[PDB]
Amino acid sequence: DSKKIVGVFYKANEYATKNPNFLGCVENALGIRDWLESQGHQYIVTDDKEGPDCELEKHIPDLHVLISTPFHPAYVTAERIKKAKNLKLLLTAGIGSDHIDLQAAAAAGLTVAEVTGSNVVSVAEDELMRILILMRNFVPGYNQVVKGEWNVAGIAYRAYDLEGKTIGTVGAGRIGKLLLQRLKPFGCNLLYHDRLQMAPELEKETGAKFVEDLNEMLPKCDVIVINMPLTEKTRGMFNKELIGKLKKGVLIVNNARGAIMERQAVVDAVESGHIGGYSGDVWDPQPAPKDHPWRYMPNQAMTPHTSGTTIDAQLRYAAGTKDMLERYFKGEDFPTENYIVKDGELAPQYR
């Protein structure tokens, strides 16, 4: 049976023609249009997703599948679900489904799925990059170039080699483990904290040592890398008190969640110098407002939230979405780890 598939993405405009492999946008649309159309399906793609009169609302009443990404999410409210006569399947071309009312999706008998695990190398690489940027003091150097300056002393006094430094990851899930594997050849003192100790062999291969007590690990670190979920426990954990316990001049890398830090506590400790540098691509709020203080604080090496939307990540997102569409058309189960809701059943982790 012919299906109506709706994809919601932002417009990349000229960027989409400069790079036809930029799949996560309206213009290239996951690179699945030719295939969908060849199979007799309709593929409607739009960025116009907000308001009673938006293009998306024209299609909600009769679409079968709705696809979006956390970069320009089509919010799936109970109100919208109730209007959707044919809707069966919600796909995230990426990871993240916070824009979906999962309980309402479950109540309506829907399936909700995402491309599990497809960003992990991207984020790990990005963390390693930031460790080097902060340790080696790249940003002040770059800023001199642009300003016509040449002041070696002003860079060197806060520039170190990574070799020999103590690096701790707070969390050793998939991303943290990939990070530790990439840090191994740099000759560091690697520490990690997690609910779950890595296997002895993996500790040997990475040289990473398990520190059961997080409060024991933190003060030893030249660099701290945040690699845990945002929870009631981790929310604002990096406050004035905890930051004070860290090594004077500590460097912090955070591609996890912005709110794991107390926003102002970071600003204060960066201004005093207790934190020597802070780098990450996650913010609170996000997108970061024009006046977000982390933009303007000393020694920041921030970027917007893009580490998981490199072209290679996007290709994985598009491929996983195509695979799930094919399986949906053929009545085959998705990979178990991709399901958030399956035919009205919310996975236990999400309850």
Curated annotation (Swiss-Prot):
NAD(+) binds at R174, I175, D194, P229, L230, T231, E232, K233, N255, D281, H305, T306, S307, G308. The keyword Metal-binding does not apply. Pfam families: 2-Hacid_dh, 2-Hacid_dh_C. It catalyses: formate + NAD(+) = CO2 + NADH. It is found in: Mitochondrion; Plastid, Chloroplast. Optimum pH is 6-8. The lineage of its organism: Eukaryota, Viridiplantae, Streptophyta, Embryophyta, Tracheophyta. Substrate binds at I95, N119. GO terms for biological process: formate catabolic process. Keywords: Chloroplast, Mitochondrion, NAD, Oxidoreductase, Plastid, Transit peptide. GO terms for molecular function: formate dehydrogenase (NAD+) activity; NAD binding; oxidoreductase activity, acting on the CH-OH group of donors, NAD or NADP as acceptor. PROSITE patterns: D_2_HYDROXYACID_DH_1 (PS00065), D_2_HYDROXYACID_DH_2 (PS00670), D_2_HYDROXYACID_DH_3 (PS00671). Gene3D superfamilies: NAD(P)-binding Rossmann-like Domain (3.40.50.720). Homodimer. Its main location: mitochondrion. This is Formate dehydrogenase, chloroplastic/mitochondrial. The record marks R257, H305 as: Important for catalytic activity. Its EC number is 1.17.1.9. It comes from the Eukaryota.
